[PDB]
């Protein structure tokens, strides 16, 4: 059982929506420390790891820890009913139901039924969210895959298509590149469709840390409310 | 014959649009006191009564009273051509045509051809438009019908679906509930689809008066420009 | 070869988009004086003449003049990736490729492959863009053709449909009419679908000069960045 209060329903809705683009259903582990969730998309190409610490909730009361399963598609619809200034209350008792209350000008309570990484990276780059998002959109216009190239103090994203091509270079002098630590020239390619969903909802000024290796998965992480952690693991493109 | 001037074309367009969601054609009675119109939707579940007093028009000149029939679908298209700061001029002479002039940066004149409740309520509630609108949208996500429950100083709207449920409670202490007069516990259910169209265009801060009774129709009314009156009569759901 | 820099990617994207509504592919003549392009739509009803002088570019370097052909549909997609504050760089070397760089928070470079009026008008009218645009939209609601009537100090646009009609009159006293020079009463009709695309992107306060004659083509022109010239020649409706 628990009672968790989050200020800013819209923000929470956004997070869930992002997750729903890849995940249809998932189990949320609710502990005294926070809420965590891990799952893979249907194609088993993306792994998503979310952690929301109790510190981002205006009230976090967990009587006894518990894991709950929910349909994200159904969950998002309800959460999208909340506004930016609305407070969201998540409550769970004995029954297999989740009580979702949107409190604003009035109190609206929904009742929804509940259902039942150690990689040797050789490159780490920290870029601004705006840059990452633009790069992914540019690439989608030319190809279905985007190549990541990381060299000493240099980060490049390229996409090659039938007859078109796009390239985004970045150096320490650039405002988009905050940090870069490369042990050796690193390159690999990933599916643009996946990255599109991943960079969905991503802020403009938020810092995104990307780690990857030659022909190996990419790890992407950024924070929500500075404390919440959203980590993605994306397999390379065959 | 007449010449009626309304300041704010967009506002008028909005009113007509709302009406067009339920009504396809209707007769407008134009008298020296104002413009009135009454009609039922195709399913005969909703009755709409509109009254626009001469006081909301910047100029209201009626030479001789007259009833005119018009296709609301055609009417709305033209009215939607007007902006928020545009002045609307409605003129009618001898012929079976309505002259609609949108006056803004230029004068644009359209010519369109013309075509040819005593209930024993036991509950009256006055709520803010924002509350009513949110409640209807919440409910549409779970069911096709919404239950209205009114008790002494307590108003509740519930919707029960396959496995989901939504509930919105309201008390005098709530900002959404402005007034409540109940003679005895009153309950009934109505179709959400109808209420959706009815609460369409409804303001956020405007006061809506709802009157109903056990398993009987609901009367809903609110004002336009504080003087204009829009009254709906909605049959209970079978 | 050349290197042309334009401040405000979005603005350029808009111009190209407008052109793409009528033209699918076209050759741009790049000279030391500026960039010009002339082409006809598929139905051969509209001729478009564009001239962008070097003065509207923040940097205009043309080593050797050159004509380049491009698919506007492909071009617009890429240009739409630019924001209002982005700088656009167009570069061409030896190969049959156009290098398009959007420079903002980061530098994104696209590589796209390159592919290979003396009328006796009797009426000239200068009207505000807002008026022209509203008039075209009003007319599209009633007919597929709009009639232009120009008399001494009087300009009228009419559209007659099955049973509806629209009319927009303009005099020197009107704010929408800036100037009018008529040698004799002039009238002709044009296709609304074409005018819709032509008035696409057209500003609200920009001055549009229209010249036409009895049952003859209409010439429409307005400026982009006060220096750029966009001229349309529209054949009368049969």
From Swiss-Prot, chains A, B, C:
One of its GO terms (molecular function) is DNA binding. This is DNA polymerase sliding clamp. The lineage of its organism: Archaea, Methanobacteriati, Methanobacteriota, Thermococci, Thermococcales. The keyword Ribosomal protein does not apply. CDD domains: PCNA. It holds the Pfam family PCNA_C. Keywords: DNA replication, DNA-binding. Belongs to the PCNA family. InterPro entries: DNA_clamp_sf, Pr_cel_nuc_antig, Pr_cel_nuc_antig_C, Pr_cel_nuc_antig_CS, Pr_cel_nuc_antig_N. Homotrimer which circularizes head-to-tail (head is a N-terminus, tail is at C-terminus) to form a toroid. RFC opens the toroid so it can load on DNA. Interacts with both Pol I (pol) and Pol II (polB-polC), with Hel308 (hjm) and with Hjc. Interaction with the C-terminal PIP-box of RfcL may stabilize the toroidal structure. It comes from Pyrococcus furiosus (strain ATCC 43587 / DSM 3638 / JCM 8422 / Vc1). Sliding clamp subunit that acts as a moving platform for DNA processing. Responsible for tethering the catalytic subunit of DNA polymerase to DNA during high-speed replication. Unlike its eukaryotic paralog, loads on circular DNA without the replication factor C (RFC) clamp loader, although RFC greatly increases loading efficiency. Stimulates the ATPase activity of replication factor C (RFC) in the presence of ssDNA. Stimulates the helicase activity of Hel308 and may alter its substrate specificity. GO terms for biological process: leading strand elongation; regulation of DNA replication.
């Amino acid at each position: 059982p628990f009672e968790i209060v989050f200020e800013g329903a819209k923000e929470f809705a956004q997070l869930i929506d992002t997750a729903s683009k890849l995940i249809d259903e998932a189990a949320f582990k609710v502990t005294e420390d926070g809420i965590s969730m891990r799952a893979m998309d249907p194609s088993r190409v993306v792994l998503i790891d979310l952690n929301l610490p109790s510190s981002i909730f205006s009230k976090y009361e967990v009587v006894e820890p518990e894991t709950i399963g929910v349909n994200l598609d159904h969950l998002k619809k309800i959460l999208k009913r909340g506004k930016a200034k609305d407070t969201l209350i998540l409550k769970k008792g004995e029954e297999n139901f989740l009580e979702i209350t949107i409190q604003g000008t009035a109190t609206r309570t929904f009742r929804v039924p509940l259902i039942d990484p150690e990689l040797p990276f050789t490159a780490k780059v920290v870029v601004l969210g705006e840059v990452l998002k633009d790069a992914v959109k540019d690439a989608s216009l030319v190809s279905d895959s985007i190549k990541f190239i990381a060299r000493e103090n240099e980060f490049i994203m390229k996409a090659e298509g039938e007859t078109q091509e796009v390239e985004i270079k970045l150096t320490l002098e650039d405002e988009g590149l905050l940090d870069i630590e490369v042990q050796e020239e690193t390159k690999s390619a990933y599916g643009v469709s996946y990255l599109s969903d991943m960079v969905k909802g991503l802020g403009k000024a938020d810092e995104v840390t990307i780690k990857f290796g030659n022909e190996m998965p990419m790890q992407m992480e950024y924070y929500i409310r500075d404390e919440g952690r959203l980590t993605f693991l994306l397999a390379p493109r065959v």
